[PDB]
């Protein structure tokens, strides 16, 4: 569970990923990513609830320019 913004990213080939988005360089529209990785039960329906114990080895940073859509869960701030 939790962790950051639950955000759906197709990137240039067309391909979706769902993760908790970290940071977008509104600069360069590139967007960083940090643990990316599905959000909702494990290889079990939960026979033993999970708390956010997560680590970071499939994050990766896109150009932003190869990016085929974004559509995101939760808007973080409503007010920018």
Do not use: H
Not at 21 to 30: A, G, K, Q
Not at 57 to 70: H, P, T, V
Request: aromatic share 8%.
């Amino acid at each position: 569970p939790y962790i950051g913004s639950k955000i759906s990213l197709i990137s240039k080939a067309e391909i979706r990923y769902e993760g908790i988005l970290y940071t977008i360089d509104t600069e360069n529209s590139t967007v960083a990513l940090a643990k990316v990785r599905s959000f909702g039960t494990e290889d079990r329906p939960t026979d033993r609830p999970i708390a956010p114990r997560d680590e970071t080895f499939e994050y990766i940073i896109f150009r932003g320019s190869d990016i085929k859509d974004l559509t995101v869960c939760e808007p973080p701030k409503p007010i920018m």
